Each structure stands twice: as structure tokens, then as C-alpha cells.
Amino acid sequence: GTFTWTLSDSEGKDTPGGYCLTRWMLIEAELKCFGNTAVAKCNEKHDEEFCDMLRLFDFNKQAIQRLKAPAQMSIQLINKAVNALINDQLIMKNHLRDIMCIPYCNYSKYWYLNHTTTGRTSLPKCWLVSNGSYLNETHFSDDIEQQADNMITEMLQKEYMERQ
Amino acid sequence: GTFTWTLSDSEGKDTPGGYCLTRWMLIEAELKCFGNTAVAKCNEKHDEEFCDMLRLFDFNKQAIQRLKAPAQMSIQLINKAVNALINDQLIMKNHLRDIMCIPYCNYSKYWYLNHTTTGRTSLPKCWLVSNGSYLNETHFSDDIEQQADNMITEMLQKEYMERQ
């Protein structure tokens, strides 16, 4: 069964429909807001590691704010809730990549493109790992360029829909 | 794994590509026909409680018409067939909502918008339950208004595609 959990409202002031990651969720301890053009895609894609992590973090936020603190730490809640939050077959995908000696996502580091005048960003992609370390940019710059063109295409589609 | 069951043909005369609910499936004992613009969405959405119920009811219709009556009532057929019919993670979603004291769907009541001149309707949304009863309209009228705008948008898209 497909994940069903939805993200809570966490909009930025200039980022309606999006989702903001507060500082405790990030190593950099910065506040990062992604718009709806990136976030909405999490409800369509079944293969994005970032979106599944986004759900696990959102789950924690809601579970801690909504539920009364337990006596002793219990993991029953996640054992029952997990399939509603993540695609377990992505874990399997990355596991198979690892075994088959193919760069794989270990879920900790992501990259995105950020337009320098508008602040519009892509949905973060996982930075891949191979032979104990991260791949260099020089090993995937063609995928980065493709993401840049996908963003340009989307921007043009937006203006065209404005032409009605 | 994602549901695979498809609905049987149950078109209305003016509702091709849709699906009609006969009176025994409804408390009101009325015949209600929904068009293809609502029904087609059930094959794309993973998160609609109405669509999963629509499949369980359709399943029964086909199982009773196609299979020979059993000796004693057995539930082996559903135990094997269920994941092909519904998203079990919606049950989990509503279960978690309930526990976390968030309005949840108990699958019995739905609402939709119906245009007064054309008869075009939205795909029914679940009427939510909180603290033993149904939420009032005054607690979700903004979501209803959003559904009205989504329908207007779709109608305009249709005419625009007519302009070619």
C-alpha cells in the first residue's frame, strides 16, 4: 500500500503551499523553505528519498505535539505507522544499489538548484554515495544540468498558462 | 503494492465513462451517477476514501454475479483479494488521526459539490468525524470553497482544450 500521510502546514511567508524545515532538522541549523512546486510533487512521486524523509520528520512533529508523553520510550507507534509514511521499497532500492556496487542514497545529504533572482528551488535530490564517500559534482553534473532545464521548462509553462 | 481492481461498467445515460451507485448501496435508496471526470481520478489517487469504498462495493457486485454460491459463508476471498481493492494505509491514516485527536474519516458519509445547471459533480470527499460526531459545515467551508474553485478551473480547462 501507498503512503497516505500528509504534511502539516508549515508555509513560509513568501512560500505558500510549501513546507519549511526548521533548524533542528538540519545540520546547518538554518531555516529552509521549499515552495509548493517542489512540495506538491511529494504527493505524486513514489521514488523520492527526500519526500519520505520529509514525512518522517513531519510525523515526529505531529506525534510529539499531539500525543501525551509515554512511560518509557516505546516504538509501537512507528512499527504500526511506518508504511503510511515512507516507501519501504526505496530502502530496498538503495540497498540493492549498494550490493550491486552502484551509487546509492544513504538518506542524509541532498542537493537542489536555487534560482539567484527568484529564490525558486527544485525538490532536493539525494547526493549519492559510492565506495565509502560522496560522489563528486564532476560525476553527476549532467544530471544537475537536466534539473536546471526541467526548472526552466516549468517556469515557461507557468507564463504560458498565464497567457490563458 | 498498489490496488489493481477496476470498476465494472456502470454508466449512466448522460454519464458515460462514469459509475452509478444503485439504491441498495445507499442509505437514501436513490440512484446516483458520477461522471468520468470524478471517477477517472480513482485510478490516479492513492488517498481517496470514497474510491476505495467504490471498489469494495464493485467487488461484491462482481463476486456475487460471477461466482457460484459457497457452502457456508467464507471470507477467504476477501482475505486474499483485499489489497487489490483498497489502500490499507488509508485505514491506518484515519486510525492515526483518531488517536492523535484529529478529525478522521470513518468511511460512512461523503459530500460533493453539484452544479445546478449542468449536473456536473465533484468526486465525493469524506465528511469527517471528531469527538463522537460529524464536523459542522462551518468547520470546513473553506475546503468546500476550494473544491468549488477546483471545479471551475477544470471546466475552464475543458473549454480551452476545445479552442485547440
Partner: antibody, heavy 119, light 107 residues
Framework: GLLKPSETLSLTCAVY????????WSWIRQPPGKGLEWIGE???????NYNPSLKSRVTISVDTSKNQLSLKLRSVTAADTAVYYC??????????????????????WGQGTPITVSS | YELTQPPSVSVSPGQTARITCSGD??????AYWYQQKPGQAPVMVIY???ERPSGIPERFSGSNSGTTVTLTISGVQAEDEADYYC???????????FGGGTKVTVL
């Protein structure tokens, strides 16, 4: 009026109005000579949030048979001397904000009721 | 979570007063500004970062630059002498914080 250090404070914004559905009502206090401090808020669904440092001593509730909004503060140990106010806040007509809302504000204020705590 | 405001400003009549407010959650949260004159309850002056509520004079206008917000009073009148406060929520929402309050005097 005057409260003793171990007494419970009970205030109702009956005069201003309260328990109006669709709004998130809140309580605020201002110790004399100080800035404003948020106490807590209640959604139309009955859900509440409290200032984390105050939370263990405070209850906010709405009596829907009376249409009255009220605050109960336990162990009012002198430091709680302040002017207490209600504010109406934001409205909500969507499911997503029914039990929690990322934001609120205090638009109309309920005049203010000075509370003296002493012995 | 705290918001920082200067404790006071002073403006000659007819000049422009500016009071600022800062904090880390501000790129996500909206600030609201309130005016309190001695003896009364605060009245909201700026709604969200810049919008002026009905009944508030055109002199009052807000703005923001990311982690800071500000209230500008153009053409300050003696009528505007008051303690002005900002508020915003914490990064995760839920907790609402008022700033220290800026005393604006009209000399």
C-alpha cells in the same frame, strides 16, 4: 479582586464575549511595568496550547452552554500579579486548522482585568 | 525564542519614526504590531507584516527584510506617542512571543 498565594485564579471574559465558534480565543497578561506575556489559546474545537513555562498551572476552556470563555490558574504565588486580557484571534473554517494553527494574533482585546495577589 | 526591539525611539513631530523587531523564525512567521497607550488594552496597528487594519491611520505602514520586520510611522503626530510591541510565533509555531516593546516618544 485579591488572591492569596495558594489560591486559584478564575477569570471569565463574559463581558467581552467568548466561545464564538470559528475563532481561536486567547489569554494574555501584563505584569505592571512589563511587556506582554502570552498565556495560552483555545481553538473552536476545544484544543489548547499554553505558554510552556506556565502550562502546568493553567487551564483554558470554553463553556458552550454558557458561551463563556474562562481561565483557571493554579498556585497563584504573587508573581502572577498582572492585568489579564482576552483576545479573539483568527478565525478557522478549514479542517487543517481545527485543532492547531501555526499562527494567531490578538486583534480585539477584552479591556483588561487587574489581578492582585498578596497576603 | 525571543524577539528584539529597541527599548525606545524619539521623533520630532512631523518626522518619521521607525521601530524594528528581529528574530530567527521571522522568515517563516508573520509579525503583528500592537499599540498600547497608558491605561488601555493594546490595539493592533499592523496585521501580518505590513497590512493596515481598518481604522488605523495611513501613517502606519509595515515592511520586512527576512529576519527583521519594521513599523514605520510617517508624519508622526502627538497622537502616536505609545508603547509599540511586535509579536510572532516560534519556528515551529505554537508558542507566541511578544517583543520587549518600544517606547515611542513624540518630544
Amino acid at each position: 479582586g485579591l488572591l492569596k498565594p495558594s489560591e486559584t485564579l478564575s477569570l471569565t471574559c463574559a463581558v467581552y464575549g467568548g466561545s464564538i465558534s470559528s475563532y481561536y480565543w486567547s489569554w494574555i497578561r501584563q505584569p505592571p511595568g512589563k511587556g506582554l506575556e502570552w498565556i495560552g489559546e483555545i481553538s473552536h474545537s476545544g484544543s489548547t496550547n499554553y505558554n510552556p513555562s506556565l502550562k502546568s498551572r493553567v487551564t483554558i476552556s470554553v463553556d458552550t452552554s454558557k458561551n463563556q470563555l474562562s481561565l483557571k490558574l493554579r498556585s497563584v504565588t504573587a508573581a502572577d500579579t498582572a492585568v489579564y486580557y482576552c483576545a479573539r484571534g483568527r478565525d478557522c473554517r478549514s479542517v487543517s486548522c481545527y485543532v492547531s494553527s501555526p499562527e494567531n494574533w490578538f486583534d480585539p482585546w477584552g479591556q483588561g482585568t487587574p489581578i492582585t495577589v498578596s497576603s | 525564542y525571543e524577539l528584539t526591539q529597541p527599548p525606545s525611539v524619539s521623533v520630532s513631530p512631523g518626522q518619521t519614526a521607525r521601530i524594528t523587531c528581529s528574530g530567527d523564525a521571522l522568515p517563516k512567521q508573520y509579525a503583528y504590531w500592537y499599540q498600547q497607550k497608558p491605561g488601555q488594552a493594546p490595539v493592533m496597528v499592523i496585521y501580518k507584516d505590513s497590512e493596515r487594519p481598518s481604522g488605523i491611520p495611513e501613517r502606519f505602514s509595515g515592511s520586512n527584510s527576512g529576519t527583521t520586520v519594521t513599523l514605520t510611522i510617517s508624519g508622526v503626530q502627538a497622537e502616536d506617542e505609545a508603547d509599540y510591541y511586535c509579536q510572532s510565533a516560534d519556528s515551529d509555531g505554537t508558542y507566541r512571543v511578544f517583543g520587549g516593546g518600544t517606547k515611542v516618544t513624540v518630544l
